[PDB]
Ligand binder design. Structure first.
Ligand SMILES: N=C(N)c1ccc(O)c(Oc2cc(C(=O)O)cc(Oc3cccc(-c4ncc[nH]4)c3)n2)c1
Ligand SMILES: [Ca+2]
Ligand SMILES: [Ca+2]
Length: 223
């Protein structure tokens, strides 16, 4: 996250860190046994870290649980990043408390202009590299589809939305992938891709969650 602020320990209780010996992607807890992340974050041997603030310090409210099953969306296309969403089932149920909570699925899509909260442990520099140890937050509006498509001709599908600022300076970035985009209390997006970070006229691109609720609900119920 570029140009955001320190969230504060456990202010985003549904935020998950995917670890394979190090942090490599964010995720969202949707219930005691399931996590939603981006398909491009798929790896074998994932450990889900819940209740995290500083990812390099054991602060006391963490739960570390291995993944038993990973399910990449059936139509995920690694070339276009169309349908960039995956579900991760935990080995054992997480213990929900004030620091570890689930986020609800939307009952409808959100309008352009709606303010969202994006969070992650990704790079905080526009051009350069600096990774934070603590969770970073950013408030950003969903952009009109026409501005999204104008920034990335021929690359935006109906399963994607842009959020951010056209003027640059504030965005998600490498390390934030798979992380939540919450608008009006519902998970509306997943950090997917971009062109650089916080660059002018290059907003962040996010998986549009509202198109996947029946797939999510049906998949979890059968696994
Ligand atoms: N500014 C952001 N909001 C943002 C969010 C997450 C990131 O990881 C990110 O940074 C990057 C970094 C690269 C890279 O170094 O190769 C690729 C990428 O997008 C890709 C990667 C792979 C494919 C594509 C692609 N294919 C066709 C459309 N887009 C884009 N995103 C930026
Ligand atoms: Ca801390
Ligand atoms: Ca920690």
């Amino acid at each position: 996250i570029v140009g955001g602020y320190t969230c504060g320990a456990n202010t985003v209780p549904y935020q998950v860190s995917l670890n394979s010996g190090y942090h490599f992607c964010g995720g969202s807890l949707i219930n005691s046994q399931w996590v939603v992340s981006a398909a491009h974050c798929y790896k074998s041997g994932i450990q889900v870290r819940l209740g995290e603030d500083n990812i390099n310090v054991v602060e006391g409210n963490e739960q570390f649980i291995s993944a038993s099953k990973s399910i990449v969306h059936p139509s995920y296309n690694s070339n276009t990043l169309n349908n960039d969403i995956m579900l991760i089932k935990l080995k054992s149920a997480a213990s929900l408390n004030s620091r570890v909570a689930s986020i609800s699925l939307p009952t409808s899509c959100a309008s352009a202009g709606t303010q969202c909260l994006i969070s992650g442990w990704g790079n905080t520099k526009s051009s350069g590299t600096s990774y934070p140890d603590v969770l970073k937050c950013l408030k950003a509006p969903i952009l009109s589809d026409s501005s999204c498509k104008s920034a990335y001709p021929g690359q935006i599908t109906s399963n994607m939305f842009c959020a951010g600022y056209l003027e640059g300076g504030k965005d998600s970035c490498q390390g934030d992938s798979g992380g939540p985009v919450v608008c009006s209390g519902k998970l509306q997006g997943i950090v997917s891709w971009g062109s650089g970070c916080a660059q002018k006229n290059k907003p962040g691109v996010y998986t549009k969650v509202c198109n996947y609720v029946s797939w999510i609900k049906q998949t979890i119920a059968s696994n």
